[PDB]
């Protein structure tokens, strides 16, 4: 569990890792701000795992980057509601098809 | 085309037919070229060497006839088409124009001099080769059409 704490400390340092990646647009694989190998298992290596899901919201480039992107327009309810409405409407259309087939024959 | 059940088959029929076929490719009526091909399914098959040369040429044309230009010529020097092959040969394809040469590739004089050079269009191949408001007018009409439907 101490190890988990150690990664937790790195997890706590993740905030400091947030510091390194909040002021600039990153673009520095030089981890001089912290104290770790420039390629310490893929740089800090937290960016990789962090980039998955619980992320700094960056893209990384593998040529030197870590550029934060900031997805400012994910929640556009247009798409979700339109898709759901189309699904239910096609269900209704199938129902009407059955009704018309039965009524005609 | 005439039924002509009595029509006695002659070796000329096959020879002459290929001449059209060879010419048809010459006049870049490729659609017509296949049209004739499908008219003689029993001829082409595997026999009828007379008409076998053009089809090989056509295949080479859809494939790289440019390299195979002289391969088919050497495949059979003559098939009673001594002149027939001549028209095709002198009608060298030049679709390769969509590329770069002339001190940019340098290979593919008289060709480099024809109509000044190559066939004439463009320039020296080494040196050869957004707006909403314009969209505004076109879109405006489209939008009204949708409204026009909602009239009645």
């Amino acid at each position: 569990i101490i190890s988990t704490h150690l990664a937790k400390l790195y997890d706590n340092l993740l905030e400091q890792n947030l510091i390194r990646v909040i002021e600039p647009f990153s673009r520095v694989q030089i981890e001089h701000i912290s104290s770790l190998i420039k390629l310490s298992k893929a740089d800090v290596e937290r960016k990789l795992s962090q980039m998955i899901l619980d992320k700094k919201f960056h893209g990384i480039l593998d040529q030197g980057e870590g550029v934060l992107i900031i997805f400012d327009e994910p929640p556009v309810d247009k798409t979700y509601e339109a898709a759901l409405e189309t699904i239910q409407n096609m269900s209704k259309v199938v129902d009407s098809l059955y009704n018309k087939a039965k009524k005609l024959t | 085309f005439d039924y002509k059940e009595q029509l006695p088959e002659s070796a000329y029929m096959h020879q002459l037919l290929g001449l059209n076929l060879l010419f048809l490719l010459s006049q870049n009526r490729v659609a017509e070229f296949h049209t004739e091909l499908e008219r003689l399914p029993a001829k082409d098959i595997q026999t009828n060497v007379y008409i076998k040369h053009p089809v090989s040429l056509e295949q080479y044309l859809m494939e790289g006839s440019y390299n195979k230009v002289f391969l088919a010529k050497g495949n059979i020097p003559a098939e009673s088409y001594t002149f027939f092959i001549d028209i095709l040969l002198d009608t060298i394809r030049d679709e390769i124009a969509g590329c770069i040469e002339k001190a940019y590739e340098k290979i593919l004089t008289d060709y480099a001099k024809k109509r000044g050079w190559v066939l004439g269009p463009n320039n020296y191949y080494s040196f050869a080769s957004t707006t909403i408001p314009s969209t505004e007018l076109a879109k405006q009409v489209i939008e009204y059409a949708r409204q026009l439907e909602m009239i009645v």
């Binding site: 990789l48 998955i52 593998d62 040529q63 898709a83 | -």
Partner: protein, 379 residues
Amino acid sequence: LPKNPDLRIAQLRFLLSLPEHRGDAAVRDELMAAVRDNNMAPYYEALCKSLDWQIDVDLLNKMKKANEDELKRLDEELEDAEKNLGESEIRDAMMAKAEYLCRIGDKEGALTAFRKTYDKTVALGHRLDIVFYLLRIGLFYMDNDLITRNTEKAKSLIEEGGDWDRRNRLKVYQGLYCVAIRDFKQAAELFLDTVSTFTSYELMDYKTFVTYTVYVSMIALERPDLREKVIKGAEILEVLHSLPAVRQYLFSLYECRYSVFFQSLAVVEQEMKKDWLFAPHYRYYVREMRIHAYSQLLESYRSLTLGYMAEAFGVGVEFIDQELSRFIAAGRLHCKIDKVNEIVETNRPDSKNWQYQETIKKGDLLLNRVQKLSRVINM
């Protein structure tokens, strides 16, 4: 419920095709089973298939007389139950005889032998048990029709009533069947009940079941649900503790150990081919996991040098190049390779604009449906 058939025998029979050279390993136990439960038809089938056994069938025929004795006992007990005033005693006697037959062989045990018992069903639980017996025997011989019919019988009405253990057994049976088929989402979901699996006769033991559960989940399940279910499954954790290699394989992907992950993929592919009821799909499994690993690794990076992949994976570089090319061509991996520069990029997001793509996709189908309806109704 009981070890009516021998899934071990079935596994040996299947595996006795390519590596049938080690007679000690498989043929000896098969003979033991043949001399056990009076399994006449199975060993006769195995005989006619490959081996003769010569003299070592007369003694089998001798126990056939023993089976005949049991068969004769049937008559006796039959009449004893038939003359007996009490009802359902004939039913129990003939059910026992049919059980002895089914261990003896498929056809005799199957069919009326059980169906007739299923005709007279005083007890709902008893007939549900007979249905389960039919399902098990059908699975042993890979009788898809029988499997479907038994499943329909169980889930249609036999399911009605309070029988929880029956529900668990039925869920496990459906899961195993779906595993035999190349559909994995259903199997992964159905193996949720890994907490309460008893020690079912069908499965060799708990370990094999958990191994199948982890395998199916690691394909069907998704990363969040992956960490939630398999990674935190207490009993799952104990089981994988029992089996080290599987544990390392599972954790390798989640913790992003890739070279060892590929070694695990190789060994598990070998085992997958070796086994029965799963082997026919090994190629699909391996290719799917390769696709998954590539997709996971590439997701983080918007750009990537193939040298990095080579380092992360095995040293070689041609393998990753050709595999990426193939999968890109197949339409997976949602990337775009490049040469000379030796870089790989990402592509459009699903929710960014592919929202519009999906909307148009669904709209096309809706439009076709409405058009056909209009044509039909418009006389």
